[PDB]
Short mmCIF file of N, CA, C and O in Angstrom, two decimals:
data_model
loop_
_atom_site.label_atom_id
_atom_site.label_comp_id
_atom_site.label_asym_id
_atom_site.label_seq_id
_atom_site.Cartn_x
_atom_site.Cartn_y
_atom_site.Cartn_z
N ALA R 13 -5.69 5.69 -11.40
CA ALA R 13 -5.54 5.49 -12.83
C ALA R 13 -5.09 4.06 -13.11
O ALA R 13 -5.15 3.18 -12.25
N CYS R 14 -4.63 3.83 -14.33
CA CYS R 14 -4.13 2.54 -14.80
C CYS R 14 -2.60 2.64 -14.82
O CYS R 14 -2.00 2.98 -15.84
N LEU R 15 -1.98 2.34 -13.68
CA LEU R 15 -0.58 2.66 -13.44
C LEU R 15 0.34 1.56 -13.97
O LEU R 15 -0.10 0.51 -14.44
N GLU R 16 1.65 1.81 -13.87
CA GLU R 16 2.70 0.96 -14.43
C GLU R 16 3.66 0.59 -13.31
O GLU R 16 4.15 1.47 -12.59
N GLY R 17 3.94 -0.70 -13.17
CA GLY R 17 4.87 -1.15 -12.14
C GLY R 17 4.90 -2.65 -12.00
O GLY R 17 4.60 -3.38 -12.95
N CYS R 18 5.25 -3.11 -10.80
CA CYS R 18 5.40 -4.52 -10.48
C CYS R 18 4.18 -5.00 -9.70
O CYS R 18 4.00 -4.64 -8.53
N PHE R 19 3.35 -5.80 -10.35
CA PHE R 19 2.18 -6.44 -9.75
C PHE R 19 2.38 -7.96 -9.81
O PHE R 19 3.40 -8.45 -10.30
N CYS R 20 1.39 -8.70 -9.32
CA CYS R 20 1.36 -10.14 -9.46
C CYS R 20 -0.08 -10.55 -9.77
O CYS R 20 -1.00 -9.75 -9.56
N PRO R 21 -0.30 -11.76 -10.28
CA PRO R 21 -1.58 -12.08 -10.96
C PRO R 21 -2.78 -11.89 -10.06
O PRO R 21 -2.64 -11.78 -8.83
N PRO R 22 -3.99 -11.85 -10.63
CA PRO R 22 -5.17 -11.44 -9.84
C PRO R 22 -5.54 -12.41 -8.74
O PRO R 22 -6.21 -12.00 -7.78
N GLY R 23 -5.15 -13.68 -8.84
CA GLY R 23 -5.37 -14.60 -7.74
C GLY R 23 -4.51 -14.33 -6.53
O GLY R 23 -4.83 -14.83 -5.44
N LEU R 24 -3.44 -13.56 -6.68
CA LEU R 24 -2.47 -13.30 -5.62
C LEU R 24 -2.56 -11.84 -5.20
O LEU R 24 -2.65 -10.95 -6.05
N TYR R 25 -2.53 -11.61 -3.89
CA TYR R 25 -2.55 -10.27 -3.31
C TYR R 25 -1.30 -10.05 -2.47
O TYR R 25 -0.70 -10.99 -1.96
N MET R 26 -0.93 -8.78 -2.32
CA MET R 26 0.39 -8.41 -1.84
C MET R 26 0.46 -8.48 -0.32
O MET R 26 -0.38 -7.90 0.38
N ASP R 27 1.47 -9.17 0.18
CA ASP R 27 1.75 -9.29 1.61
C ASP R 27 2.87 -8.32 1.99
O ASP R 27 3.62 -7.84 1.14
N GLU R 28 2.98 -8.06 3.29
CA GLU R 28 3.94 -7.07 3.78
C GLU R 28 5.38 -7.46 3.49
O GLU R 28 6.24 -6.59 3.32
N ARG R 29 5.68 -8.76 3.44
CA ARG R 29 7.05 -9.25 3.37
C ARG R 29 7.55 -9.42 1.94
O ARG R 29 8.45 -10.23 1.69
N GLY R 30 6.99 -8.69 0.98
CA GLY R 30 7.46 -8.70 -0.39
C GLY R 30 6.83 -9.76 -1.25
O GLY R 30 6.58 -9.53 -2.44
N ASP R 31 6.59 -10.93 -0.69
CA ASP R 31 5.82 -11.94 -1.40
C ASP R 31 4.36 -11.51 -1.47
O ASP R 31 3.88 -10.72 -0.65
N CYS R 32 3.66 -12.02 -2.48
CA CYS R 32 2.23 -11.85 -2.60
C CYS R 32 1.57 -13.22 -2.55
O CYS R 32 2.11 -14.20 -3.06
N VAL R 33 0.40 -13.26 -1.93
CA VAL R 33 -0.22 -14.50 -1.48
C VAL R 33 -1.69 -14.48 -1.87
O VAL R 33 -2.26 -13.41 -2.13
N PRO R 34 -2.35 -15.64 -1.91
CA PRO R 34 -3.81 -15.64 -2.05
C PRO R 34 -4.47 -15.02 -0.84
O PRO R 34 -3.84 -14.74 0.19
N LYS R 35 -5.78 -14.80 -0.96
CA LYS R 35 -6.53 -14.13 0.09
C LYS R 35 -6.88 -15.04 1.26
O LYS R 35 -7.66 -14.63 2.13
N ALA R 36 -6.32 -16.26 1.32
CA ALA R 36 -6.55 -17.13 2.46
C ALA R 36 -5.71 -16.70 3.65
O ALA R 36 -6.23 -16.57 4.77
N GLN R 37 -4.41 -16.47 3.44
CA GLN R 37 -3.50 -16.02 4.48
C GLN R 37 -3.18 -14.53 4.36
O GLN R 37 -2.05 -14.12 4.63
N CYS R 38 -4.16 -13.74 3.96
CA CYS R 38 -4.00 -12.30 3.82
C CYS R 38 -4.46 -11.67 5.13
O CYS R 38 -5.66 -11.72 5.43
N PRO R 39 -3.57 -11.10 5.94
CA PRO R 39 -3.98 -10.69 7.29
C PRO R 39 -4.94 -9.51 7.29
O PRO R 39 -5.21 -8.86 6.28
N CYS R 40 -5.47 -9.25 8.49
CA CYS R 40 -6.39 -8.16 8.75
C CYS R 40 -5.66 -7.04 9.49
O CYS R 40 -4.69 -7.28 10.21
N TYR R 41 -6.15 -5.82 9.30
CA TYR R 41 -5.52 -4.60 9.81
C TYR R 41 -6.52 -3.80 10.63
O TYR R 41 -6.71 -2.59 10.44
N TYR R 42 -7.19 -4.47 11.56
CA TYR R 42 -8.20 -3.84 12.39
C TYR R 42 -7.55 -2.89 13.39
O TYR R 42 -6.72 -3.31 14.19
N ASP R 43 -7.95 -1.62 13.34
CA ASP R 43 -7.47 -0.61 14.28
C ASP R 43 -5.96 -0.44 14.19
O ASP R 43 -5.29 -0.12 15.17
N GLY R 44 -5.40 -0.68 13.00
CA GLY R 44 -3.97 -0.69 12.79
C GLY R 44 -3.30 -2.01 13.11
O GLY R 44 -2.28 -2.35 12.50
N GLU R 45 -3.84 -2.76 14.07
CA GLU R 45 -3.22 -3.99 14.52
C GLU R 45 -3.28 -5.06 13.44
O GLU R 45 -4.34 -5.31 12.86
N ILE R 46 -2.14 -5.68 13.18
CA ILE R 46 -2.02 -6.69 12.13
C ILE R 46 -2.33 -8.04 12.75
O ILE R 46 -1.51 -8.60 13.50
N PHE R 47 -3.51 -8.58 12.44
CA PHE R 47 -3.95 -9.87 12.94
C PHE R 47 -3.71 -10.96 11.90
O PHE R 47 -3.75 -10.71 10.69
N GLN R 48 -3.47 -12.16 12.39
CA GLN R 48 -3.16 -13.30 11.54
C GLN R 48 -4.45 -13.82 10.89
O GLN R 48 -5.55 -13.41 11.26
N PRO R 49 -4.34 -14.71 9.90
CA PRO R 49 -5.53 -15.10 9.13
C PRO R 49 -6.62 -15.79 9.94
O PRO R 49 -7.76 -15.83 9.48
N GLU R 50 -6.30 -16.36 11.10
CA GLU R 50 -7.31 -16.95 11.98
C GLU R 50 -7.02 -16.45 13.39
O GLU R 50 -6.13 -16.98 14.07
N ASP R 51 -7.77 -15.44 13.83
CA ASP R 51 -7.61 -14.85 15.15
C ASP R 51 -9.00 -14.54 15.70
O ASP R 51 -9.55 -13.46 15.44
N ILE R 52 -9.55 -15.48 16.45
CA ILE R 52 -10.77 -15.19 17.20
C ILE R 52 -10.40 -14.27 18.35
O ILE R 52 -9.30 -14.36 18.92
N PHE R 53 -11.31 -13.37 18.69
CA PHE R 53 -10.92 -12.11 19.30
C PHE R 53 -12.14 -11.41 19.87
O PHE R 53 -13.12 -11.22 19.14
N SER R 54 -12.11 -11.03 21.14
CA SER R 54 -13.31 -10.47 21.74
C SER R 54 -13.02 -9.85 23.09
O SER R 54 -12.27 -10.41 23.90
N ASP R 55 -13.63 -8.69 23.33
CA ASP R 55 -13.85 -8.18 24.67
C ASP R 55 -15.09 -8.87 25.23
O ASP R 55 -15.56 -9.86 24.68
N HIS R 56 -15.63 -8.35 26.34
CA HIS R 56 -16.86 -8.92 26.88
C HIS R 56 -18.03 -8.74 25.93
O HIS R 56 -18.80 -9.68 25.70
N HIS R 57 -18.18 -7.55 25.35
CA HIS R 57 -19.39 -7.18 24.64
C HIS R 57 -19.31 -7.40 23.13
O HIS R 57 -20.28 -7.87 22.53
N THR R 58 -18.18 -7.08 22.51
CA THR R 58 -18.02 -7.26 21.07
C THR R 58 -17.43 -8.64 20.77
O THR R 58 -16.89 -9.31 21.64
N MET R 59 -17.56 -9.04 19.50
CA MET R 59 -17.07 -10.33 19.03
C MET R 59 -16.57 -10.11 17.61
O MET R 59 -17.35 -9.69 16.75
N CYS R 60 -15.30 -10.42 17.37
CA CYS R 60 -14.67 -10.11 16.09
C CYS R 60 -13.74 -11.25 15.70
O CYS R 60 -13.11 -11.86 16.56
N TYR R 61 -13.65 -11.52 14.40
CA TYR R 61 -12.68 -12.47 13.88
C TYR R 61 -12.23 -12.06 12.48
O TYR R 61 -12.89 -11.27 11.80
N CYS R 62 -11.08 -12.60 12.08
CA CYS R 62 -10.45 -12.34 10.79
C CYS R 62 -10.54 -13.60 9.94
O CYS R 62 -9.97 -14.63 10.31
N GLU R 63 -11.26 -13.52 8.82
CA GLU R 63 -11.51 -14.69 8.00
C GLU R 63 -10.52 -14.82 6.85
O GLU R 63 -9.76 -15.79 6.80
N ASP R 64 -10.51 -13.84 5.94
CA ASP R 64 -9.75 -13.94 4.70
C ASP R 64 -9.18 -12.60 4.25
O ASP R 64 -8.92 -12.42 3.05
N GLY R 65 -8.97 -11.67 5.17
CA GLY R 65 -8.53 -10.33 4.84
C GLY R 65 -9.39 -9.28 5.50
O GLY R 65 -8.91 -8.20 5.86
N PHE R 66 -10.67 -9.60 5.67
CA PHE R 66 -11.63 -8.71 6.30
C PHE R 66 -11.86 -9.13 7.74
O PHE R 66 -11.76 -10.30 8.10
N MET R 67 -12.18 -8.14 8.57
CA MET R 67 -12.39 -8.32 10.01
C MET R 67 -13.89 -8.30 10.27
O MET R 67 -14.51 -7.23 10.28
N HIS R 68 -14.46 -9.48 10.50
CA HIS R 68 -15.90 -9.61 10.74
C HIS R 68 -16.21 -9.34 12.21
O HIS R 68 -16.09 -10.23 13.05
N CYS R 69 -16.62 -8.11 12.52
CA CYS R 69 -17.06 -7.76 13.87
C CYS R 69 -18.58 -7.83 14.01
O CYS R 69 -19.33 -7.71 13.04
N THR R 70 -19.01 -8.04 15.25
CA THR R 70 -20.42 -8.02 15.63
C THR R 70 -20.53 -7.32 16.98
O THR R 70 -19.58 -6.68 17.43
N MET R 71 -21.69 -7.43 17.63
CA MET R 71 -21.88 -6.85 18.96
C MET R 71 -22.75 -7.77 19.82
O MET R 71 -23.04 -7.46 20.97
N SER C 20 12.75 -24.73 37.40
CA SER C 20 11.75 -25.76 37.61
C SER C 20 10.82 -25.86 36.39
O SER C 20 10.17 -24.86 36.06
N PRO C 21 10.72 -27.00 35.72
CA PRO C 21 9.83 -27.09 34.55
C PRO C 21 8.37 -27.27 34.88
O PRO C 21 7.53 -27.06 33.99
N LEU C 22 8.04 -27.66 36.11
CA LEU C 22 6.68 -28.09 36.41
C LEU C 22 5.62 -27.02 36.15
O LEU C 22 4.50 -27.40 35.78
N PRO C 23 5.89 -25.73 36.33
CA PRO C 23 4.88 -24.73 35.93
C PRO C 23 4.79 -24.50 34.44
O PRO C 23 3.68 -24.41 33.90
N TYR C 24 5.93 -24.39 33.75
CA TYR C 24 5.91 -24.25 32.30
C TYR C 24 5.23 -25.43 31.61
O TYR C 24 4.79 -25.29 30.47
N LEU C 25 5.16 -26.57 32.28
CA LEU C 25 4.29 -27.66 31.84
C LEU C 25 2.84 -27.37 32.19
O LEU C 25 1.94 -27.66 31.40
N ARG C 26 2.60 -26.80 33.37
CA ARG C 26 1.24 -26.47 33.78
C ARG C 26 0.63 -25.39 32.90
O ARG C 26 -0.59 -25.37 32.69
N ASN C 27 1.45 -24.49 32.37
CA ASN C 27 0.94 -23.40 31.55
C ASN C 27 0.72 -23.82 30.10
O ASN C 27 -0.03 -23.16 29.39
N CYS C 28 1.37 -24.90 29.66
CA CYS C 28 1.09 -25.44 28.33
C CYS C 28 -0.32 -25.99 28.24
O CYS C 28 -1.09 -25.63 27.35
N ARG C 29 -0.68 -26.89 29.16
CA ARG C 29 -1.96 -27.57 29.11
C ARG C 29 -3.14 -26.61 29.23
O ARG C 29 -4.24 -26.95 28.79
N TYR C 30 -2.93 -25.43 29.81
CA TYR C 30 -3.95 -24.40 29.82
C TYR C 30 -4.00 -23.62 28.52
O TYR C 30 -5.02 -22.99 28.22
N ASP C 31 -2.92 -23.64 27.73
CA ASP C 31 -2.87 -22.89 26.49
C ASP C 31 -3.33 -23.73 25.31
O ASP C 31 -4.08 -23.25 24.45
N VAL C 32 -2.88 -24.98 25.23
CA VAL C 32 -3.19 -25.82 24.08
C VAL C 32 -4.67 -26.17 24.04
O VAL C 32 -5.25 -26.31 22.95
N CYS C 33 -5.31 -26.32 25.19
CA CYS C 33 -6.74 -26.62 25.25
C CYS C 33 -7.62 -25.40 25.08
O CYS C 33 -8.81 -25.56 24.77
N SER C 34 -7.09 -24.20 25.27
CA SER C 34 -7.89 -22.98 25.33
C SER C 34 -7.88 -22.18 24.04
O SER C 34 -8.90 -21.58 23.69
N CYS C 35 -6.76 -22.16 23.32
CA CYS C 35 -6.61 -21.20 22.25
C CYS C 35 -7.18 -21.75 20.94
O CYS C 35 -7.54 -22.92 20.83
N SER C 36 -7.26 -20.87 19.95
CA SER C 36 -7.90 -21.22 18.69
C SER C 36 -7.08 -22.24 17.92
O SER C 36 -7.64 -23.18 17.34
N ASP C 37 -5.76 -22.07 17.89
CA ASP C 37 -4.85 -22.98 17.19
C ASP C 37 -3.82 -23.47 18.19
O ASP C 37 -2.92 -22.72 18.59
N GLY C 38 -3.92 -24.74 18.59
CA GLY C 38 -2.95 -25.33 19.48
C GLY C 38 -1.62 -25.66 18.85
O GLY C 38 -0.74 -26.19 19.54
N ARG C 39 -1.43 -25.37 17.57
CA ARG C 39 -0.13 -25.59 16.94
C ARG C 39 0.91 -24.62 17.48
O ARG C 39 1.94 -25.04 18.02
N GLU C 40 0.66 -23.32 17.35
CA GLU C 40 1.65 -22.33 17.76
C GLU C 40 1.57 -22.02 19.25
O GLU C 40 2.57 -21.61 19.85
N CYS C 41 0.39 -22.20 19.86
CA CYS C 41 0.29 -22.09 21.31
C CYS C 41 1.21 -23.10 21.99
O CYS C 41 1.76 -22.82 23.06
N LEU C 42 1.35 -24.27 21.40
CA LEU C 42 2.31 -25.25 21.88
C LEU C 42 3.73 -24.73 21.75
O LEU C 42 4.52 -24.78 22.70
N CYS C 43 4.06 -24.21 20.59
CA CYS C 43 5.43 -23.84 20.25
C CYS C 43 5.77 -22.41 20.63
O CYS C 43 6.84 -21.93 20.26
N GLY C 44 4.87 -21.73 21.34
CA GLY C 44 5.19 -20.50 22.04
C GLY C 44 5.25 -20.70 23.54
O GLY C 44 5.59 -19.77 24.28
N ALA C 45 4.93 -21.91 24.01
CA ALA C 45 5.04 -22.29 25.41
C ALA C 45 6.31 -23.07 25.68
O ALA C 45 6.93 -22.90 26.74
N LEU C 46 6.70 -23.96 24.76
CA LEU C 46 7.98 -24.63 24.87
C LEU C 46 9.13 -23.63 24.79
O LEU C 46 10.18 -23.84 25.42
N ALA C 47 8.96 -22.55 24.03
CA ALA C 47 9.97 -21.51 23.96
C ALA C 47 10.00 -20.64 25.21
O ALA C 47 11.03 -20.03 25.49
N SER C 48 8.89 -20.56 25.94
CA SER C 48 8.90 -19.87 27.22
C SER C 48 9.84 -20.54 28.21
O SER C 48 10.35 -19.89 29.12
N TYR C 49 10.07 -21.84 28.04
CA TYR C 49 10.96 -22.59 28.91
C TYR C 49 12.41 -22.47 28.45
O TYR C 49 13.30 -22.21 29.26
N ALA C 50 12.65 -22.65 27.15
CA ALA C 50 13.99 -22.51 26.61
C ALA C 50 14.52 -21.09 26.77
O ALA C 50 15.73 -20.89 26.90
N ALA C 51 13.63 -20.10 26.75
CA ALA C 51 14.05 -18.72 26.94
C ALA C 51 14.45 -18.43 28.38
O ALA C 51 15.16 -17.45 28.63
N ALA C 52 14.01 -19.25 29.33
CA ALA C 52 14.44 -19.14 30.71
C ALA C 52 15.63 -20.03 31.01
O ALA C 52 16.50 -19.65 31.80
N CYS C 53 15.68 -21.21 30.40
CA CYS C 53 16.88 -22.03 30.46
C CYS C 53 18.07 -21.27 29.88
O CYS C 53 19.20 -21.40 30.36
N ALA C 54 17.83 -20.47 28.84
CA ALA C 54 18.90 -19.72 28.21
C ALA C 54 19.28 -18.48 29.01
O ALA C 54 20.43 -18.04 28.95
N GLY C 55 18.34 -17.92 29.76
CA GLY C 55 18.65 -16.80 30.62
C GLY C 55 19.49 -17.15 31.83
O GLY C 55 19.94 -16.24 32.53
N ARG C 56 19.72 -18.44 32.07
CA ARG C 56 20.60 -18.91 33.13
C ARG C 56 21.89 -19.52 32.62
O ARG C 56 22.85 -19.62 33.39
N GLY C 57 21.93 -19.93 31.35
CA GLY C 57 23.16 -20.38 30.73
C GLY C 57 23.01 -21.54 29.77
O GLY C 57 23.89 -21.77 28.93
N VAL C 58 21.91 -22.28 29.86
CA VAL C 58 21.71 -23.51 29.11
C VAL C 58 20.93 -23.19 27.84
O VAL C 58 19.78 -22.74 27.91
N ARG C 59 21.54 -23.45 26.70
CA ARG C 59 20.85 -23.44 25.41
C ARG C 59 20.48 -24.86 25.03
O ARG C 59 21.25 -25.81 25.23
N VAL C 60 19.28 -25.01 24.46
CA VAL C 60 18.73 -26.30 24.08
C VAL C 60 18.44 -26.28 22.59
O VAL C 60 18.02 -25.25 22.04
N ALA C 61 18.66 -27.42 21.94
CA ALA C 61 18.38 -27.60 20.52
C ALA C 61 17.11 -28.44 20.41
O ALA C 61 17.18 -29.66 20.29
N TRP C 62 15.96 -27.77 20.44
CA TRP C 62 14.66 -28.43 20.49
C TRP C 62 13.83 -28.24 19.23
O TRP C 62 12.63 -28.56 19.25
N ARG C 63 14.42 -27.78 18.13
CA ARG C 63 13.68 -27.54 16.90
C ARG C 63 13.82 -28.72 15.96
O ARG C 63 14.91 -29.28 15.79
N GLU C 64 12.71 -29.10 15.35
CA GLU C 64 12.61 -30.19 14.39
C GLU C 64 11.64 -29.76 13.29
O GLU C 64 10.94 -28.75 13.45
N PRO C 65 11.55 -30.49 12.17
CA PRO C 65 10.46 -30.23 11.23
C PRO C 65 9.09 -30.50 11.81
O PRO C 65 8.10 -29.93 11.32
N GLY C 66 8.99 -31.34 12.84
CA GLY C 66 7.74 -31.58 13.52
C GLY C 66 7.52 -30.63 14.69
O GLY C 66 6.41 -30.14 14.88
N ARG C 67 8.58 -30.37 15.46
CA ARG C 67 8.48 -29.52 16.64
C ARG C 67 8.83 -28.07 16.31
O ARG C 67 9.68 -27.44 16.94
N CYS C 68 8.15 -27.55 15.30
CA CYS C 68 8.01 -26.11 15.04
C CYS C 68 9.37 -25.43 14.83
O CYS C 68 9.81 -24.59 15.62
N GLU C 69 10.01 -25.80 13.73
CA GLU C 69 11.12 -25.01 13.21
C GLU C 69 10.57 -23.85 12.41
O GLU C 69 9.73 -24.04 11.52
N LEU C 70 11.02 -22.64 12.72
CA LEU C 70 10.52 -21.48 12.00
C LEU C 70 11.15 -21.44 10.61
O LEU C 70 12.20 -22.02 10.36
N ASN C 71 10.47 -20.75 9.70
CA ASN C 71 10.84 -20.68 8.29
C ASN C 71 11.49 -19.33 8.02
O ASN C 71 10.83 -18.36 7.64
N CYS C 72 12.80 -19.26 8.23
CA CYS C 72 13.53 -18.09 7.82
C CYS C 72 13.40 -17.94 6.30
O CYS C 72 13.42 -18.95 5.59
N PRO C 73 13.24 -16.72 5.77
CA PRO C 73 13.09 -16.59 4.32
C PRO C 73 14.33 -17.07 3.57
O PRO C 73 15.35 -17.42 4.16
N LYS C 74 14.21 -17.09 2.24
CA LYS C 74 15.26 -17.64 1.39
C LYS C 74 16.57 -16.88 1.56
O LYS C 74 17.65 -17.47 1.44
N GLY C 75 16.50 -15.57 1.82
CA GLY C 75 17.72 -14.81 2.04
C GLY C 75 18.43 -15.22 3.32
O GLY C 75 19.66 -15.25 3.37
N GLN C 76 17.67 -15.54 4.36
CA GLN C 76 18.22 -15.86 5.67
C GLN C 76 18.34 -17.37 5.87
O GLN C 76 17.86 -18.17 5.06
N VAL C 77 19.00 -17.74 6.96
CA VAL C 77 19.15 -19.13 7.38
C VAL C 77 18.92 -19.19 8.88
O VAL C 77 19.23 -18.25 9.62
N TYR C 78 18.36 -20.31 9.34
CA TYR C 78 18.19 -20.53 10.76
C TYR C 78 19.54 -20.56 11.47
O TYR C 78 20.56 -20.96 10.90
N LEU C 79 19.54 -20.13 12.73
CA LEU C 79 20.77 -20.07 13.51
C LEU C 79 20.41 -20.12 14.98
O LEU C 79 19.46 -19.46 15.42
N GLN C 80 21.18 -20.89 15.75
CA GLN C 80 20.86 -21.15 17.15
C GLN C 80 21.41 -20.06 18.06
O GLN C 80 20.67 -19.46 18.84
N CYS C 81 22.71 -19.80 17.98
CA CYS C 81 23.39 -18.86 18.86
C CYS C 81 24.29 -18.00 17.98
O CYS C 81 25.30 -18.49 17.46
N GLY C 82 23.93 -16.73 17.82
CA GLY C 82 24.65 -15.83 16.93
C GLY C 82 24.75 -14.43 17.49
O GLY C 82 24.17 -14.10 18.53
N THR C 83 25.48 -13.59 16.76
CA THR C 83 25.80 -12.24 17.18
C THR C 83 24.94 -11.24 16.43
O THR C 83 25.17 -11.03 15.22
N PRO C 84 23.93 -10.59 17.06
CA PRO C 84 23.21 -9.49 16.41
C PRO C 84 23.93 -8.15 16.57
O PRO C 84 23.39 -7.19 17.14
N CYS C 85 25.16 -8.08 16.07
CA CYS C 85 25.95 -6.85 16.03
C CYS C 85 26.46 -6.53 14.64
O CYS C 85 26.47 -5.36 14.25
N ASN C 86 26.88 -7.54 13.88
CA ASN C 86 27.39 -7.38 12.53
C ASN C 86 26.37 -7.81 11.48
O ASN C 86 26.75 -8.30 10.41
N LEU C 87 25.09 -7.65 11.78
CA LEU C 87 24.01 -8.09 10.89
C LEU C 87 23.45 -6.94 10.06
O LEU C 87 23.44 -7.01 8.83
N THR C 88 22.98 -5.89 10.72
CA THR C 88 22.26 -4.84 10.02
C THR C 88 23.23 -3.91 9.29
O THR C 88 24.36 -3.69 9.72
N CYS C 89 22.74 -3.36 8.18
CA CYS C 89 23.54 -2.44 7.39
C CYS C 89 23.77 -1.12 8.12
O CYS C 89 24.72 -0.40 7.79
N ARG C 90 22.93 -0.79 9.10
CA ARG C 90 23.16 0.38 9.93
C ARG C 90 24.40 0.24 10.79
O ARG C 90 24.95 1.26 11.24
N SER C 91 24.86 -0.98 11.03
CA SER C 91 26.05 -1.19 11.85
C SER C 91 27.29 -0.60 11.20
O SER C 91 28.12 0.02 11.88
N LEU C 92 27.43 -0.78 9.88
CA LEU C 92 28.60 -0.25 9.19
C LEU C 92 28.59 1.27 9.15
O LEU C 92 29.66 1.89 9.07
N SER C 93 27.41 1.88 9.18
CA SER C 93 27.34 3.34 9.19
C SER C 93 27.76 3.91 10.53
O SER C 93 28.38 4.97 10.58
N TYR C 94 27.44 3.20 11.62
CA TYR C 94 27.80 3.60 12.98
C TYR C 94 28.60 2.46 13.61
O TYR C 94 28.10 1.74 14.48
N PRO C 95 29.86 2.27 13.19
CA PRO C 95 30.64 1.15 13.73
C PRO C 95 31.18 1.41 15.12
O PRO C 95 31.31 0.46 15.90
N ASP C 96 31.49 2.66 15.45
CA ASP C 96 32.09 2.98 16.74
C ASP C 96 31.17 2.68 17.92
O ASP C 96 31.66 2.58 19.05
N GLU C 97 29.87 2.54 17.69
CA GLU C 97 28.95 2.24 18.78
C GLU C 97 29.21 0.85 19.34
O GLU C 97 29.59 -0.08 18.61
N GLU C 98 29.00 0.71 20.64
CA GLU C 98 29.19 -0.56 21.31
C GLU C 98 27.96 -1.45 21.12
O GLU C 98 26.82 -0.98 21.08
N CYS C 99 28.21 -2.76 20.99
CA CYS C 99 27.16 -3.78 20.92
C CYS C 99 27.47 -4.81 22.01
O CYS C 99 28.09 -5.85 21.76
N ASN C 100 27.02 -4.51 23.22
CA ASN C 100 27.22 -5.39 24.37
C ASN C 100 26.04 -6.35 24.50
O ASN C 100 25.36 -6.42 25.53
N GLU C 101 25.80 -7.09 23.42
CA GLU C 101 24.67 -7.99 23.32
C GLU C 101 25.13 -9.44 23.46
O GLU C 101 26.32 -9.76 23.34
#
C-alpha cells in the first residue's frame, strides 16, 4: 500500500547502517552474502559481479 | 619477521580488483601479529587508511571491549577477560 513512516528522497536508497545512499554504493545480497559495490567474483565456470545494487551473473 | 608480510602484499595489490583496501588489509596483517606479541603500532593516517568510525563513535587505538555494549550492564557479574 501507500504507507506512512520515515523515508528519504527518491535519489537515495536505504543502507543497512541507518544512513541511506545513492545506488552507486548500494551493496548486493547474492545468496544472502552482502557484497560490496565493486566485487568481481567467480568460480571456475560462473562469472559474477556487483555493479550498482544488482548482481550481474553469467556462465 | 616482516619479510613475508611484505611478500604477501605485492601478491595482493597487483592481483585484486581494488588495491586500496588490499593494501590496508595486508599492513594490518602485520600489526595484528606485532600486537599479538606485545607491540602496538600507530600506523593510521588520512592517507594510510584510517577507518571512518560513524559520528556516534570515535577512533581508538587500545581500549576495553567490556564496558561498551548495553548488554554489559544487564549482565555485569560476567567476567570480561579480554
